[PDB]
Design a protein around this ligand. Sequence first.
Ligand code: HEM
Ligand SMILES: [Ca+2]
Ligand SMILES: [Ca+2]
Length: 306
Amino acid sequence: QLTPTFYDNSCPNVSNIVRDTIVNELRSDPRIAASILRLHFHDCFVNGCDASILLDNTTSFRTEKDAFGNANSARGFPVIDRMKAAVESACPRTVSCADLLTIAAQQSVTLAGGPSWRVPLGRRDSLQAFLDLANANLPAPFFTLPQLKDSFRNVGLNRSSDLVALSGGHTFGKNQCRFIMDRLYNFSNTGLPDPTLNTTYLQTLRGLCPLNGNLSALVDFDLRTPTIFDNKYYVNLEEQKGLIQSDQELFSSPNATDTIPLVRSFANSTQTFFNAFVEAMDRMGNITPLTGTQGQIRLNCRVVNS
Ligand code: HEM
Ligand SMILES: [Ca+2]
Ligand SMILES: [Ca+2]
């Protein structure tokens, strides 16, 4: 089983080295904390948190980086390489890329103002990447609530609290216009905007994402505090200001009888949200890990050891 003290003897300063790397990177790229948290999410939803997403192409298997949910979207890979190199220097062949990414995600959340906790450790690295599985398992912004629930259950997260709390990752970070164009101009083939999108906010978003405009333009997930990890994400939902369809459905879907009270509870109390986020994060980080002698301790996160 995974344990928070896994490296307390072999690499006691691993978390500190990871933190320093992110602090430095944040000065030039304020979006990196959000990007790293997402990388961990995308790692865990595909064969578990085994650093499979970090592998590059080989002639025998395709990289998950070319999945619909990763291509021209996932980012921060060089930053992970940097901290890995620093950790390898401090503690040679000790910390797996899977664990490194998990610590990086937690430290990113904390640095952005979120809760602080010690993540379970002991994960090992995959011997292959899973592109098809990534295309099948990563949820999409246009998913209905039942589809979102299905996606989480598919990887082992049965609880609606898992879904509502982890969706809180959208309390910061960016989103491309491409993913909300339907909500703004032609939702579900009606030629009309998504009725669950606040009309005042609709105008603002249309100005940022005009029809026939730059689909790659970026917009903030949280209009209240764009880069701070807090519970404002849920306050937005209560006012019909969730950015993407999958955000707003947590509060407005006909199937939201179970998620609405969770959204409200997290919007009403930072402590309630933070506690639920840590609980859900650790549950996601516990998805089908390779442990013991399974897999390996990858030296270069981009390639399997040889
Ligand atoms: C519930 C289903 C989810 C859907 C459909 C979804 C969808 C998306 C989409 C469409 C983007 C924008 C990508 C781009 O513009 O390139 C994104 C970004 C992001 N997501 Fe989610 N997401 C989900 C769950 C999560 C979870 C569980 C986390 C983490 C706990 C997460 C963290 C993030 C972060 C932090 C960003 C910003 C990344 C950056 O700015 O680099 N997402 N997500
Ligand atoms: Ca994985
Ligand atoms: Ca925020």
